């Protein structure tokens, strides 16, 4: 698992030569295709994203082809000719409370971030800015702020949703994340 799923793990940031992901991201098709958290690039001058190699970290630039403000997710697409190992989008499957998830993701200096946990709640709302987000999961998984906008997966490696970490009132990292479902039916306008 920890093997197959970070090549489809990305880092998003801006297009700075020695800027470094300031979030996460999730390939989901083969062309370049990137799902990642709105808030984490709707401010960004251009967008840069940070693809593990095996000859180091390579960075595309990706445009924004479809915001889903109301979830806070943004599809994005690396201006490539490349092709990439992927999240399949048929593959995508619900999880549960008490299911042990894992939350990928990638630092500042594009290393991989894994951590697992249960899946504690099915139905939580959150208030990403001026959105009220209605129906996401929590789970443990999610310790970190560059997790945000990465992928949680089952442990079969299914993508089953979009992390987002969010700040309790007392500063402690609480993990979210929006049902991978919601990609799938507000993206049928797309591939
Ligand atoms: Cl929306
Ligand atoms: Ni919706």
């Not at 999730?26 to 994203?49: D, R």
């Not at 594009?110 to 697992?116: S, T, Y």
């Not at 089952?154 to 049902?179: M, R, S, Y």
């Amino acid at each position: 698992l920890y093997h197959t799923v970070p090549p489809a793990v990305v880092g998003v940031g801006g297009g700075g030569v020695n800027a470094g992901p300031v979030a996460s991201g999730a390939i989901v098709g083969t062309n370049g295709y990137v799902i990642t958290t709105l808030h984490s690039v709707s401010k960004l001058p251009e967008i840069s994203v940070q693809v593990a190699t095996t000859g180091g970290i390579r960075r595309f630039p990706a445009q924004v082809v479809k915001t889903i403000p109301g979830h806070d997710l943004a599809l994005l697409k690396m201006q490539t000719t490349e092709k990439f190992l992927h999240f399949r989008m048929a593959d995508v499957q619900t999880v549960v409370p008490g299911q042990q998830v894992f939350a990928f993701g990638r630092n500042m200096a594009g290393a991989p971030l894994v951590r697992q946990g249960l899946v504690q709640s099915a139905d939580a709302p959150l208030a990403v800015g001026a959105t009220q987000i209605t129906h996401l999961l929590r789970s443990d998984a999610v310790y970190s702020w560059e997790q945000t906008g990465g992928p949680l997966v089952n442990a079969q490696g299914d993508l089953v949703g979009i992390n987002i970490a969010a700040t309790g009132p007392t500063g402690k990292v609480e993990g979210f994340t929006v049902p991978a479902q919601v990609i799938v039916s507000h993206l049928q306008d797309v591939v």
